[PDB]
Amino acid sequence: NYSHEPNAVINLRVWALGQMVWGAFLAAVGVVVVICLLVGTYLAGLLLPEQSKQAPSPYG
Amino acid sequence: MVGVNFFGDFDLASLAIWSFWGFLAFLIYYLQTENMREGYPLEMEDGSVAPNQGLFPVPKPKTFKLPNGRGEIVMPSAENEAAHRRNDLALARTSVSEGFPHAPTGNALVDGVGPASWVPRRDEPELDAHGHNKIMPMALAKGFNVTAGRDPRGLPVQAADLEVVGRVSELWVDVPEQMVRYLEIDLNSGKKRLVPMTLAKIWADRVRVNAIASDSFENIPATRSASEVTKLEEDKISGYVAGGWLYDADKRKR
């Protein structure tokens, strides 16, 4: 009974928005996981001795 | 009388301002008591009489002696409130608590509730000083002619659902005031029905009534007389029509 939208257009509009936002939520999840990955990497690197950030370059 | 303090800093100015505060207090009393002649005693939703009857007491009855031998009206009084009291009300409590609405049980435009409510004014018409009826159709009003404006008579009557229902026939006028109160309709259904001019907008090609839709124009209360109209019928009609701004809105277009 509740949740009943009489109008055809409003029903279509709330559906399409749901679909679009679902996709954007997937993308955000992916971006966030990548971000956590790289950032945790950097941080764990901060736990390392100072000679890690001193190393000579290979020029390449 | 400059620099003359009776005591402390109190001079004629202070005395006057304080006297004014006092007079004003008495005056608010007076006015908010004279605004009690109609509506009190306070009721509950049950129709009972409640404990909180206000902090201002209801005043002592006065008397209105009416013209044309219509009698004496006493306000505040029990006769006054009981005459204008509606009964057989199609309403249902929305909750046992107070301060919540009461839904219309059936068709409200008919059941006379809400914006469509009416009040039992007396089924005697409104009169001028001479005792002649106030509202006459323009044809009985001797000498009455359109002095300006768009003569609506004969124009179709568009309604809220944009559909058409009939044609205007006659104009009901306030002769002592020289103005048009109601307009009559020759409906498709073969019936005559009034509609207040304040609810009808005269266009060049038509008369628009955005209040109500077409299904309603037929169930409008009628008049027991085609030359006169009483206060009661006026309230019924006007309430019915005005209720369409709420109860026929699902039908209104444009």
Binding site: - | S14, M138, K231
Partner: protein
């Protein structure tokens, strides 16, 4: 969606000459007129007036007043019509010099002022009596006269009483369009800042309240005109859904309400209290208080 501001359809008929309730019909006129420019916003009948004794007194005296001021305007203008229509607003029948005190001014400007004021006196009081009588002849109440008396109270306080108490007709108002404005300003500036005249504040409160109230009342009565709320006398005696709806609007809005007669009682007071408080606040200016900002400081609504 018809708001009832401008009348759509006009109608008319033989003029409504009057109601014979003890009125002297011979002192009444018999010619009327229709002027549709008004019919759009009101009745179009410029109906018969009553030509009575008090009315004749008033007309004669006030026309002498008007034309007296115009005479001095001319003399002050060099009789040059272009100067008249140039300095029309800057001209003035200024008030007597203080040297004369309350005596009959020994100058032309001064005595012309004095006489014009005598004429105004006669006119205003005649008109007040005319209100009383027109309401006594139709058998109505004298509320209109007791309201006008309030206006007269202020007007007197400004022209006649306050000066007598101060001993100078110099204190009274000049008869000009810009000079009486200058008079108001100089009156405030001489006596402190008039704002701090509590009775000035009250008269203001009631002016603003009168506007508040008339907008309220008018908008209401046009809102409930679709139920004939415009016909009020019949909703005091035979109450209908118009009055009920208006009352309940104001109840549900601000918790209190009025009746189709008590709102009229509220109006009669917000109106007259504009000039009752003003008269007092003007009397007390200079007779009881030479400065109002200091009175405030002393009385606690202004800081040290």
């Amino acid at each position: 969606e018809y708001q009832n501001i401008f009348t759509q359809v006009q109608v008319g008929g033989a003029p409504e000459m009057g109601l014979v309730e003890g009125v002297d019909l011979s002192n009444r006129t018999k010619g009327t007129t229709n002027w549709t420019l008004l019919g759009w916003f009101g009745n179009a009948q410029i109906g018969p007036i009553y030509l009575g004794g008090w009315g004749t007194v008033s007309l004669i005296s006030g026309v002498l007043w008007f034309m007296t001021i115009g005479a001095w305007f001319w003399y002050e203008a060099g009789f040059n019509p272009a100067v008249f229509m140039r300095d029309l607003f800057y001209l003035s029948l200024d008030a007597p010099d203080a040297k004369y005190g309350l005596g009959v001014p020994r100058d032309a400007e001064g005595i012309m002022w004095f006489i014009a004021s005598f004429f105004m006196f006669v006119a205003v009081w005649s008109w007040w009596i005319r209100t009383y009588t027109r309401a006594a002849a139709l058998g109505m109440g004298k509320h209109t006269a007791w309201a006008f008396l309030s206006a007269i109270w202020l007007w007197m306080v400004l022209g006649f009483i306050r000066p007598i108490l101060m001993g100078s007709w110099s204190e009274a108002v000049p008869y000009g369009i810009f000079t009486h404005l200058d008079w108001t300003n100089n009156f405030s500036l001489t006596y402190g800042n008039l704002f701090y005249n509590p009775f000035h504040g009250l008269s203001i409160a009631f002016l603003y309240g009168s506007a508040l109230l008339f907008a309220m009342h008018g908008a209401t009565i046009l809102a409930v005109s679709r139920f004939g709320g415009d016909r009020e006398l019949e909703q005091i005696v035979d109450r209908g859904t118009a009055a009920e709806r208006a009352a309940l609007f104001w109840r549900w809005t601000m918790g209190f309400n009025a009746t189709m007669e008590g709102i009229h009682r509220w109006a009669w007071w917000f109106g007259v209290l504009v000039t009752l408080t003003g008269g007092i606040g003007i009397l007390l200016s200079g007779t009881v208080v030479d400065n109002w900002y200091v009175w405030a400081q002393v009385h606690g609504y202004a800081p040290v």
